[PDB]
Give the backbone structure.
Amino acid sequence: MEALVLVGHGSRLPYSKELLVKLAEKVKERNLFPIVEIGLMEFSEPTIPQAVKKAIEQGAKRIIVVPVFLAHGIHTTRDIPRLLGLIEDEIPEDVEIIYREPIGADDRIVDIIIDRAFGR
Amino acid sequence: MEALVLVGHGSRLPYSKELLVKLAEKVKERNLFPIVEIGLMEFSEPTIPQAVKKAIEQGAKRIIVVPVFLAHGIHTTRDIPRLLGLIEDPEDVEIIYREPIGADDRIVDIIIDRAFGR
């Protein structure tokens, strides 16, 4: 009934997509959502509209979109909201989009950064 | 004798720099490094060269540069290594260029919190 759609920037290099793919597979291992999909804003497929459409086709009525971005930027305030039809510039009536917050300066990001600082 | 330099993308919007400032503030509260600085690749200051120079001028002999990026891209493979002089485009000072965040289990934890509005 509900889907998690992870959306990322995309890249002409493969690492941004590989990131989202690994993150989605880990989320799937958690067994929290019946439907998990990824979408890339630019350069690579699946795109964000394709990811949302896939979620709908699989039967999701609530689509939770999590922007896998560290900070807000034009991507998360304009481009992705536009793609999702959330701001003015096909979502069935019985489907709601829930657009969530980016990662931000989470304490766990500090933990990761310190590990990286020490090469771990 | 060692500094942590957090480098971020930078943005015409203020959120990217605000993120790096807040992260640096939280690192400083953990009292692990005598010197902590931020640098932004573009659009905004401190720049990455300025951040490294500040660290050196404060006496750091080993500069640990952590790219605050989720995944590698042209910025972490080309642009930042070039600014740091690590690839073709300081005597007693060593630059240690670390890995980005990547698909860390803790990113999954954050994503799930965000998914549920937390």
